Amino acid sequence: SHMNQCPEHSQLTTLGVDGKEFPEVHLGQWYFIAGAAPTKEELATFDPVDNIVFNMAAGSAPMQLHLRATIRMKDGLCVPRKWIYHLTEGSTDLRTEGRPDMKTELFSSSCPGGIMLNETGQGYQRFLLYNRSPHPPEKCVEEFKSLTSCLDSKAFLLTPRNQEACELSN
Ligand SMILES: CCCCCCCCCCCCCC(=O)O
Numbered sequence: 001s002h003m004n005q006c007p008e009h010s011q012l013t014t015l016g017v018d019g020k021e022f023p024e025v026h027l028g029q030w031y032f033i034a035g036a037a038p039t040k041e042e043l044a045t046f047d048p049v050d051n052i053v054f055n056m057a058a059g060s061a062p063m064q065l066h067l068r069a070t071i072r073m074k075d076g077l078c079v080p081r082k083w084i085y086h087l088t089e090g091s092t093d094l095r096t097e098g099r100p101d102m103k104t105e106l107f108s109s110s111c112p113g114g115i116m117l118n119e120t121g122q123g124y125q126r127f128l129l130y131n132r133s134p135h136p137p138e139k140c141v142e143e144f145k146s147l148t149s150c151l152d153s154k155a156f157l158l159t160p161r162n163q164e165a166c167e168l169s170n
Pocket of ligand 1: 023026056065106115128
């Protein structure tokens with residue numbers, strides 16, 4: 001029996017020589033590229049968004065990362081966000097304090113310079129695609145849509161990225 005798998009994708013792992021290269025390898029800037037979810041409503045929050053730039057930094061205490069983002073809305077306005085992720089020994093999963101109920105799984109990406117998140121939470125799930133480049137190859141994005149659709153997240157949103165990034169700070 002055959003023809004019943006989704007394209008190859010793997011969860012990031014802290015295993016193997018170079019395992020403790022997580023998280024330092026992923027620090028720095030990222031751009032939001034696309035989302036996919038079981039329903040359009042799980043992506044609705046992104047509909048007035050033109051682009052988002054993020055900066056991930058080492059935290060102010062041991063197992064913690066500082067995330068900063070500025071959202072360019074389609075109306076030109078810039079909205080800054082900030083939060084803290086918590087890391088756990090031997091895992092690449094992210095947890096944020098609101099709430100203990102949600103987790104974020106990290107997956108490797110066919111996009112060079114890309115990463116995919118799988119966000120799980122109360123009554124919802126969505127897949128989120130980021131890249132170091134604000135303009136990764138269209139093929140990367142097609143592959144993310146094809147993968148997420150195979151995983152039954154068929155509602156898809158591509159961020160337009162027509163306008164300049166808002167300023168962030170590193
Ligand atoms: C150390 C892991 C680095 C992963 C890089 C992705 C950086 C951007 C994360 C954005 C989080 C999504 C926030 C949201 O759901 O609104």
